[PDB]
Short mmCIF file of C-alpha atoms and ligand atoms in Angstrom, two decimals:
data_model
loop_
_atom_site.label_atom_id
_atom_site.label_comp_id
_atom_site.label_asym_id
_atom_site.label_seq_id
_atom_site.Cartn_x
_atom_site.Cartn_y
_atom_site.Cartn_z
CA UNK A 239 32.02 -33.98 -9.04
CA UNK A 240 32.36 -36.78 -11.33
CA UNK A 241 30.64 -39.23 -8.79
CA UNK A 242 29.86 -42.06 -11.16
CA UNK A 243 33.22 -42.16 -12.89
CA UNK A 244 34.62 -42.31 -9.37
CA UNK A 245 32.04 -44.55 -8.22
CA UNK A 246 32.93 -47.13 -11.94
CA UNK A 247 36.99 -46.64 -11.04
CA UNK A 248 36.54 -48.07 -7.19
CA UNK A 249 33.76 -50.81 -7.86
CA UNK A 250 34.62 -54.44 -8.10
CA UNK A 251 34.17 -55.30 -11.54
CA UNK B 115 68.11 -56.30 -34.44
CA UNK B 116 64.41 -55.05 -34.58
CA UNK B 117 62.65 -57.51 -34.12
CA UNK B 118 60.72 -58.01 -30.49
CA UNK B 119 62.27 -59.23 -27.28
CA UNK B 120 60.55 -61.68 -24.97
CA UNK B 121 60.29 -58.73 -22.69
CA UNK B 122 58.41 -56.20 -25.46
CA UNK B 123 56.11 -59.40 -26.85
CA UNK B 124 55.21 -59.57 -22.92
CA UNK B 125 54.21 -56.08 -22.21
CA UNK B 126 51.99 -56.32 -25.64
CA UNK B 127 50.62 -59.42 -24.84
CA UNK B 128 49.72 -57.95 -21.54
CA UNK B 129 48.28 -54.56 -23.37
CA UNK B 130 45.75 -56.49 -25.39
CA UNK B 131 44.89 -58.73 -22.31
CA UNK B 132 43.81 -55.46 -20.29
CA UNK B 133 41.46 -54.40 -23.41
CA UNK B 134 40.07 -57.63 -23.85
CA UNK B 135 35.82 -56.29 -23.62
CA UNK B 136 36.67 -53.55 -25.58
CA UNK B 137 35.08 -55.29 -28.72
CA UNK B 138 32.87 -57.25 -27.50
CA UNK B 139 28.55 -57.62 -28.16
CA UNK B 140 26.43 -54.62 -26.57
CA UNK B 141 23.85 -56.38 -23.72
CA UNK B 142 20.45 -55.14 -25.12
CA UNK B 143 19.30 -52.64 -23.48
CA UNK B 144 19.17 -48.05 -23.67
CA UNK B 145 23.10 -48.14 -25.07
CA UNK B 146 22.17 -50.76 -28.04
CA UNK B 147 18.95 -49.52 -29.12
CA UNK B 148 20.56 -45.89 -29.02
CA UNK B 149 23.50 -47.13 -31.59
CA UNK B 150 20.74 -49.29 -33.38
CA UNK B 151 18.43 -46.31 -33.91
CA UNK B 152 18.83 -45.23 -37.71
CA UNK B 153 17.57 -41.90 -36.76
CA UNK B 154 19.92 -40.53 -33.47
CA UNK B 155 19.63 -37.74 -31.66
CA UNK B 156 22.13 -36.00 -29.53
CA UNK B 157 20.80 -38.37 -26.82
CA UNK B 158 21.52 -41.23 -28.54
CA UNK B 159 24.75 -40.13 -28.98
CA UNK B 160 25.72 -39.61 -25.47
CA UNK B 161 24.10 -43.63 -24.87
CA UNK B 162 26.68 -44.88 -27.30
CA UNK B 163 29.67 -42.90 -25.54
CA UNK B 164 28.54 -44.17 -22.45
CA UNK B 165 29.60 -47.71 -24.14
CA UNK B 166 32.84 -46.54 -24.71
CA UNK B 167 34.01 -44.45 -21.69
CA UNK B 168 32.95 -47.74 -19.35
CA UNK B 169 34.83 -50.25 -21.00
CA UNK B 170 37.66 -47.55 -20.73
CA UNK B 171 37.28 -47.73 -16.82
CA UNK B 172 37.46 -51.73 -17.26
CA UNK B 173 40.44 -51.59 -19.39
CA UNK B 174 42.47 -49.35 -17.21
CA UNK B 175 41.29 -51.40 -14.14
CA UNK B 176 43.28 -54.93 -16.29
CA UNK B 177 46.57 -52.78 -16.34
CA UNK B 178 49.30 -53.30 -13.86
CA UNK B 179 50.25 -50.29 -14.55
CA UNK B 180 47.50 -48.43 -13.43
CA UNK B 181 46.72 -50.05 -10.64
CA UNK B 182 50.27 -49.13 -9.29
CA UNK B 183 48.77 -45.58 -8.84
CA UNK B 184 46.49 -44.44 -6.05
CA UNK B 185 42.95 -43.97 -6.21
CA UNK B 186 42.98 -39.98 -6.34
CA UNK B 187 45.79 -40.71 -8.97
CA UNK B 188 43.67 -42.98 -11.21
CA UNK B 189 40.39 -40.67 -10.94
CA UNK B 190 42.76 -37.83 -12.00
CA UNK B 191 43.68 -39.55 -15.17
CA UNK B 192 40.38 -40.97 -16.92
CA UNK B 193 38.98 -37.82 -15.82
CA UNK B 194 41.53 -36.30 -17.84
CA UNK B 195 41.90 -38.62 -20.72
CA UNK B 196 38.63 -39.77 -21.37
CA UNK B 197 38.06 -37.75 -24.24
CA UNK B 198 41.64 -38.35 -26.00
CA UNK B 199 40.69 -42.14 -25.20
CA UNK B 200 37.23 -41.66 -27.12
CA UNK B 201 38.65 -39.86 -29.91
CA UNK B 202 41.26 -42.67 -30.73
CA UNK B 203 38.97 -45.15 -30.92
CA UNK B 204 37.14 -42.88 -33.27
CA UNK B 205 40.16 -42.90 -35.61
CA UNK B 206 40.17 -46.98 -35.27
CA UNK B 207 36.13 -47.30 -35.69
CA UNK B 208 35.29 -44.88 -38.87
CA UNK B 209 35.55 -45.02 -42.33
CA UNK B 210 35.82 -41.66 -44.60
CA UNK B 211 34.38 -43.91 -47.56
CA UNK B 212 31.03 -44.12 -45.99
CA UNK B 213 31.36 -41.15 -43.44
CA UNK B 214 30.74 -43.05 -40.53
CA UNK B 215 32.11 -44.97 -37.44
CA UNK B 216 30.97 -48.90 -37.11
CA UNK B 217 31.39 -51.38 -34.21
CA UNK B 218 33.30 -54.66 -34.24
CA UNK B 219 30.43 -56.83 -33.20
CA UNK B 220 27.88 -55.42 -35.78
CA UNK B 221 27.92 -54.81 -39.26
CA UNK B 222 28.67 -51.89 -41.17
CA UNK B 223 25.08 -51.80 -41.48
CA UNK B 224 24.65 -49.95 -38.33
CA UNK B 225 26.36 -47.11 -37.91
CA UNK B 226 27.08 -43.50 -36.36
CA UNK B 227 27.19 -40.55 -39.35
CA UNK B 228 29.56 -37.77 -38.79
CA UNK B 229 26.64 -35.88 -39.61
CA UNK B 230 25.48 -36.25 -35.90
CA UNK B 231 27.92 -33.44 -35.42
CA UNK B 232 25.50 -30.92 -37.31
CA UNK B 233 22.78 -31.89 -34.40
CA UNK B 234 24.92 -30.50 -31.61
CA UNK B 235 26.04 -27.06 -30.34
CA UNK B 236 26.05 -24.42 -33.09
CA UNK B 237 28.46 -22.57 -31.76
CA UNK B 238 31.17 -24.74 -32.16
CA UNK B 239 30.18 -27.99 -33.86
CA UNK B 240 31.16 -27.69 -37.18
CA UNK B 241 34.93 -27.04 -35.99
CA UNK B 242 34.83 -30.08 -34.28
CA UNK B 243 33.53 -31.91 -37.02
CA UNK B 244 36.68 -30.35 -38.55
CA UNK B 245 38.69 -31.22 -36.09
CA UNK B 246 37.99 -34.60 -36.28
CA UNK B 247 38.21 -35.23 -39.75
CA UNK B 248 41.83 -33.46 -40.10
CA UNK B 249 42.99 -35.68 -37.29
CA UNK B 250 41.80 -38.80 -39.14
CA UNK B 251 43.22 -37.94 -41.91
CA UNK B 252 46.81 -37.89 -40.55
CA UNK B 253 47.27 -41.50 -39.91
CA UNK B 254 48.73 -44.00 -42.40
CA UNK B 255 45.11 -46.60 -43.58
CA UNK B 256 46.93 -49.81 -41.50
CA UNK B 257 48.47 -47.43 -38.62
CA UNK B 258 44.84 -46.79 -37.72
CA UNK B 259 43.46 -50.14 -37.81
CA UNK B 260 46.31 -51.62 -36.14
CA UNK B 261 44.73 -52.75 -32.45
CA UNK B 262 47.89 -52.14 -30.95
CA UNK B 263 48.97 -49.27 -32.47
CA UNK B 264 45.64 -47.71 -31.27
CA UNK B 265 45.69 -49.08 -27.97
CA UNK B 266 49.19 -47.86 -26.91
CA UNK B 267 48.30 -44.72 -28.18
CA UNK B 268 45.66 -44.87 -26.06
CA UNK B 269 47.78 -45.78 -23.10
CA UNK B 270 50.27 -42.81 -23.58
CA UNK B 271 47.22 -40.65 -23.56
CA UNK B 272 45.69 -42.41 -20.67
CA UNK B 273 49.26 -41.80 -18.96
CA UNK B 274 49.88 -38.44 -19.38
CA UNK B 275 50.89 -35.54 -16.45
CA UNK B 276 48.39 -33.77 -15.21
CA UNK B 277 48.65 -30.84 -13.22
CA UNK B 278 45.69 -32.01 -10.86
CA UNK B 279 48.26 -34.86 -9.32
CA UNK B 280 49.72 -33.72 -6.83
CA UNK B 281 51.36 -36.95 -5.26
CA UNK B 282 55.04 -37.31 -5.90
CA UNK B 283 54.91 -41.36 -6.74
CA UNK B 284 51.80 -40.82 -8.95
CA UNK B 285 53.81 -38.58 -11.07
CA UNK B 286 56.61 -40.53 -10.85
CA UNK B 287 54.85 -43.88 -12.33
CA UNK B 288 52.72 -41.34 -14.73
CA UNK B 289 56.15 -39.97 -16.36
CA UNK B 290 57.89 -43.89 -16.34
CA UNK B 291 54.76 -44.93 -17.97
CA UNK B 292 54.06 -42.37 -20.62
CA UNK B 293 57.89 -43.16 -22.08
CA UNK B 294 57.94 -47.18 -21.70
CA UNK B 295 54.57 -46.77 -23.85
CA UNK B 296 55.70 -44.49 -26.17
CA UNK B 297 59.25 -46.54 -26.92
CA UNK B 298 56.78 -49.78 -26.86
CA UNK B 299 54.73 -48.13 -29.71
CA UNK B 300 58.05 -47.70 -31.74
CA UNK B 301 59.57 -50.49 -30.98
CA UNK B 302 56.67 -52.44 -32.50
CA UNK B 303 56.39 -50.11 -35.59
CA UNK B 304 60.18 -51.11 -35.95
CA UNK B 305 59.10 -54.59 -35.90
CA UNK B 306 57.10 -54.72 -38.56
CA UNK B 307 58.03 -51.72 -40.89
CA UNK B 308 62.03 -51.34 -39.58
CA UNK B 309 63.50 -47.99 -40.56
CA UNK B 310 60.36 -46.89 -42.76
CA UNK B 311 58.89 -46.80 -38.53
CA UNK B 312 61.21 -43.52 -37.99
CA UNK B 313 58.80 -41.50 -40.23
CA UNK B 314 55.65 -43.01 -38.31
CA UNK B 315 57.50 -42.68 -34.90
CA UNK B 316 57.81 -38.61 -35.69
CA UNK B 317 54.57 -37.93 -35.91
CA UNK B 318 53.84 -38.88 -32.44
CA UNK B 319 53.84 -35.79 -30.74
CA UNK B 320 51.40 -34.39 -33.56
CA UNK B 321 48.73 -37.02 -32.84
CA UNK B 322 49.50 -36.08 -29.43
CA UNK B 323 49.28 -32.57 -29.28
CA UNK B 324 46.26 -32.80 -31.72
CA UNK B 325 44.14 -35.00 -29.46
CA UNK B 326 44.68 -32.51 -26.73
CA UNK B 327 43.74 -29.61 -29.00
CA UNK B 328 40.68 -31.95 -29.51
CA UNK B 329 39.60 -32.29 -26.06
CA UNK B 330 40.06 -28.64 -24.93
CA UNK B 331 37.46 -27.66 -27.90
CA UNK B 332 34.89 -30.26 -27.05
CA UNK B 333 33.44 -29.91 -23.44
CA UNK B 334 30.33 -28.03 -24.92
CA UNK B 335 29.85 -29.92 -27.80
CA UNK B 336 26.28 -31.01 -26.56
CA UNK B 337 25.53 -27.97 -24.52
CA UNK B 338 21.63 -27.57 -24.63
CA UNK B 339 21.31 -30.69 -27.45
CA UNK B 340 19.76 -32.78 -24.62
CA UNK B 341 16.90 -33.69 -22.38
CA UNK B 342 18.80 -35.19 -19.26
CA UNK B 343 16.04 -38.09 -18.92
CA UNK B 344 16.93 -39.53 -22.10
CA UNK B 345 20.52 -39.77 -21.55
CA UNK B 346 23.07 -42.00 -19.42
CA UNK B 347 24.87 -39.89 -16.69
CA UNK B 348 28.58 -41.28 -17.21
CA UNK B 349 28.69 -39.20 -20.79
CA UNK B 350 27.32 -35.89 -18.68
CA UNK B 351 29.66 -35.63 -16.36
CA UNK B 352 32.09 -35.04 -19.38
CA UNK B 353 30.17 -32.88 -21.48
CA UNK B 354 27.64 -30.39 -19.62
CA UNK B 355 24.19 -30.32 -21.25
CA UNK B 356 22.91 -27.69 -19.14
C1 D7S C 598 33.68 -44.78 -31.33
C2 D7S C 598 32.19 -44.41 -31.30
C3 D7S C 598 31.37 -45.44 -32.10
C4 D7S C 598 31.52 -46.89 -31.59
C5 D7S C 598 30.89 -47.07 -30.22
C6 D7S C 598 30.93 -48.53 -29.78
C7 D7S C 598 30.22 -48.65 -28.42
C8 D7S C 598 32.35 -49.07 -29.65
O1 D7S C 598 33.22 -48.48 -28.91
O2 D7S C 598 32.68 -50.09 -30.30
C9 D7S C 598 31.92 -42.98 -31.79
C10 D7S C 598 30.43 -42.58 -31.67
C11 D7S C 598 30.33 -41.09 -31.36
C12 D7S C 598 31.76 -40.60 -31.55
C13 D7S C 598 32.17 -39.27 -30.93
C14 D7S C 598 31.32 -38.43 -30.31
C15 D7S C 598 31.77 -37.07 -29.84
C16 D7S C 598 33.04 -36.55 -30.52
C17 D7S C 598 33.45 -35.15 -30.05
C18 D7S C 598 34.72 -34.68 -30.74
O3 D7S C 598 34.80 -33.56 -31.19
C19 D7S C 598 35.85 -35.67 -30.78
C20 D7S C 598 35.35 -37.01 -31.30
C21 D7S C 598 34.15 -37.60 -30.49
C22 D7S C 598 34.52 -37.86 -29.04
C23 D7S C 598 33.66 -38.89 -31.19
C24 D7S C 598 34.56 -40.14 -31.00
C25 D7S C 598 34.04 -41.46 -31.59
C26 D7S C 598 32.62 -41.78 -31.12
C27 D7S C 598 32.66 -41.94 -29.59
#
């Protein structure tokens, strides 16, 4: 389900 | 008459802002030695990808624009775009002289062949390789290596409708964004080229629709090319190996 691209889009960077 | 506002030398100034990291050094580490590797494998591949598609997440993250969306909203559209984004900067980084696509920070020196494409799926990898190369070939040598031509292309890609967004003010921004990109793009064109831009400004749509051809023909590109353990999981979740 995509979970690191989700996971990349919410972090703080 | 054509020349840039304060308004449009704003919004570009604020464009290459978001992608500063785009070009910058590779930390050592899997991703590196992957794109160092004279010899790649499909693997190797999908490490240098993963490169790519995270500094897209960082980029989008710098844009006001973006972050004017909601979360499901943003997920929707790198999910979507990613590839489009990837292929773009494929036009910027390759060279048909040499057959290959380079990296700012490093020299020519190292390198990914287009021949990597004859490693991957048989059933349809020599179409993309086709694909690819006819979609090169369309843009105009200083079009392509223009920064900001390629990264507002890459914005009216990244903003794009999607049928998966459902949420009326998502697709309200998407749609307002898509268009102030795309009259940005010409705009600048007009700047430096003035009516010879009109011609450039055209062809648009064919990049466009192109890319998206692209994309919709890739998704099992590396289909059974790969042992899982030897490649990063950000590339996988785009391209099924198994
Ligand atoms: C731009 C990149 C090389 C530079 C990477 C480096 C980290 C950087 O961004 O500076 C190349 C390497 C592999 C290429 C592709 C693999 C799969 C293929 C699959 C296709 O059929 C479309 C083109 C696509 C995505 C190209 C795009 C350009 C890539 C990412």
């Amino acid at each position: 389900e995509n979970a690191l691209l989700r996971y990349l889009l919410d972090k703080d960077d | 008459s054509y020349q840039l506002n304060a308004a449009e030398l704003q919004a570009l100034d604020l464009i290459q802002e978001a992608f500063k990291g785009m070009n910058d050094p590779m930390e050592q580490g899997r991703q590196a030695t992957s794109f160092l590797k004279n010899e790649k494998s499909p693997a190797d591949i999908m490490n240098i990808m993963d490169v790519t598609m995270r500094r897209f997440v960082k980029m989008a993250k710098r844009l006001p624009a973006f972050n004017d969306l909601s979360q499901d909203g943003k997920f929707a559209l790198l999910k979507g775009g990613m590839i489009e984004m990837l292929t773009v900067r494929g036009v910027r980084r390759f060279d048909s002289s040499s057959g290959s696509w380079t990296t700012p920070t490093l020299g020519e020196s190292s390198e990914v062949s287009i021949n990597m494409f004859d490693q991957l799926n048989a059933d349809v990898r020599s179409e993309q390789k086709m694909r690819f190369l006819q979609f090169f070939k369309i843009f105009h040598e200083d079009i392509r290596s223009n920064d900001l031509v390629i990264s507002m292309i890459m914005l009216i890609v990244l903003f794009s409708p999607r049928d998966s967004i459902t949420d009326p003010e998502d697709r309200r921004i998407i749609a307002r964004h898509h268009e102030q990109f795309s009259a940005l793009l010409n705009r600048y064109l007009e700047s430096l080229y003035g009516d010879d831009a009109h011609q450039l400004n055209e062809q648009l749509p064919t990049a466009l629709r192109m890319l998206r051809e692209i994309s919709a023909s890739s998704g099992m590109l590396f289909l059974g090319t790969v042992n899982t353990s030897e490649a990063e999981p950000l590339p996988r979740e785009f391209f099924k190996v198994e």
